[PDB]
Amino acid sequence: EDESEALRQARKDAELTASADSVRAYLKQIGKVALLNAEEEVELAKRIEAGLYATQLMT
Amino acid sequence: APVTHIWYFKGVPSRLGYLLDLAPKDLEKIIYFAAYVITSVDEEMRHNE
Structure with missing residues (x-):
């Protein structure tokens, strides 16, 4: 079913495929990062604000 | 960025x-950016470390 080595390495092997079509390979790779919500967006925006502030301070 | 000539990479013999002692697969x-290779290794830096 899903556990007991039937589906985990199944997913790993299915993902680890040749993907001859270039668009297919790109869509396979893009299916790796989870989507984001508003709180994550504002938190990452705060992190980027801190990063650019630190870059300005370095300058 | 450098690219590979298809005439030599792809053919009945993959020249x-x-x-380079490999396979076209x-x-x-x-x-085409699906798997990495190890360009070089440090032999002595690994033997002593």
Whole structure:
């Protein structure tokens, strides 16, 4: 079913495929990062604000 | 960025594969960004460490 080595390495092997079509390979790779919500967006925006502030301070 | 000439990578004999001792199935994965290779290793830096 899903556990007991039937589906985990199944997913790993299915993902680890040749993907001859270039668009297919790109869509396979893009299916790796989870989507984001508003709180994550504002938190990452705060992190980027801190990063650019630190870059300005370095300058 | 450098690219590979298809006439030499792809063919009935894969000339690049013959010279580098690989396979075209083990070259398309690299010159089309699907798997990495180890360009060089430090032998002594690993033997002592």
